[PDB]
Amino acid sequence: GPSGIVPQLQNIVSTVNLGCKLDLKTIALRARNAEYNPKRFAAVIMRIREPRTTALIFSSGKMVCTGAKSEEQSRLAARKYARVVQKLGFPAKFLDFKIQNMVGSCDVKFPIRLEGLVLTHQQFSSYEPELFPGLIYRMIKPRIVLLIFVSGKVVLTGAKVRAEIYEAFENIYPILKG
DNA sequence: CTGCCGAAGCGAGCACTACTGTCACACCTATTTTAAGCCCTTCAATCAAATCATCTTTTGGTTAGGATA
C-alpha cells in the first residue's frame, strides 16, 4: 500500500491558440512585459507569479505556457495572458486549450541500490553512473519516464494528469521496496 | 644497263582517390520543472611545518670544597 508520501507535482505545461496574427515588435513596444531579441530568437516570453508560470508568444498566434503546480492554475495563467493580449490591442481568443506535460516528484525514505535494479530491469532501465548520476527508467503504462536515485527520491514526467503520476508511483513502489 | 636470292641475327613454342549544382533536413536554441551528483574559482577556519626564547646537557676555563706531586 501507500507509504504515506504522495507525489507532489512540480510543473505543468499547457498551450492555447490565440486565434489571430500578432506583431512581436508591437508587443515589445507596448507591453510592460516582453522580449524581442530576433538576433537570437524572434519571440516574446511572459511570466506571472499568480499563478507562478512562464509563457511564450509568437506572431503566428500560438501560446505555450508552463510553470504552474496544477493544471487548473496553468489554465488560469493562460487566461491571464489572454486578457493581457486582448487589452494589448490584439483580438485574442482563448481557443483550443491543451495540456502538454507535467513533472512530479516523491520519495521512499530508504536507500536504493541501483545495481540490483539494472541487473533485474535492464530491458527498460538504463543505468550509466559516468555522466548522469541517477538511473533512467521508461515506463509504458502510462507513457512515463522515471528518474531514480540512491537517496530514494524519484522524478516523474511524461503524463497528462496527476492520476497517471499517482498510478505510476504505486506501480513502481513494490519494485522500489524489493 | 637492271634484278634475283643467300647469311646472319631478331623473334616464337615444349621438358613421366576532385570538385561542384541542389536542398531539406539535419544542424541550431526561445523556456519549465525536478533529483542526486557536477567542473572551475574564492575566501575563511583549521591545521601543521618552521623559527625564536628560554631551560637545560655538556665542552673549555676560574673558584676555594678538594688533592697529589
Of A125, A138, A127, A146, the C-alpha closest to A7 is A146
CB atoms near residue A82 (< 10 Å): 21
Proximity of residue A157 CB to strand B below 7 A: yes
Cell of A36: 524581442
CB atoms near residue A115 (< 10 Å): 11
Residue nearest to nucleotide B37 (CA to C1'): A133
Euclidean distance between CA atoms A47 and A30, whole angstroms: 16
Computed on alpha carbons and rounded to an integer, the radius of gyration of chain A in Å comes to 20
Euclidean distance between CA atoms A103 and A122, whole angstroms: 24
Proximity of residue A104 CB to strand B below 7 A: no
- State which approach was used to obtain the coordinates: cryo-EM
Of A90, A84, A19, A26, the C-alpha closest to A55 is A84
- Chain B footprint positions (protein CB, under 7 Å): 29-38
Q: Are A108 and A154 in contact (CB under 8 A)?
A: yes
- Give the H/E segment covering residue A162: helix A162-177
Bridge partners of residue A23, in order along the sequence: none
Q: Determine the length of chain A.
A: 178
Of A17, A18, A16, the C-alpha closest to A92 is A18
Resolution in angstroms comes to 3.3
**Binding site listing of A for DNA:** 11, 47, 62, 101, 138
Angle at A66 between CA A10 and CA A31, to 5 degrees: 140
Nucleotide nearest to A52 (CA to C1'): B32
Backbone angles phi, psi at A130, to 5 degrees: -90, -45
CB atoms near residue A158 (< 10 Å): 17
CB atoms near residue A6 (< 10 Å): 13
Tell me the three state secondary structure of residue A60.
coil
**Binding site listing of A:** 11, 47, 62, 101, 138
Proximity of residue A74 CB to strand B below 7 A: no
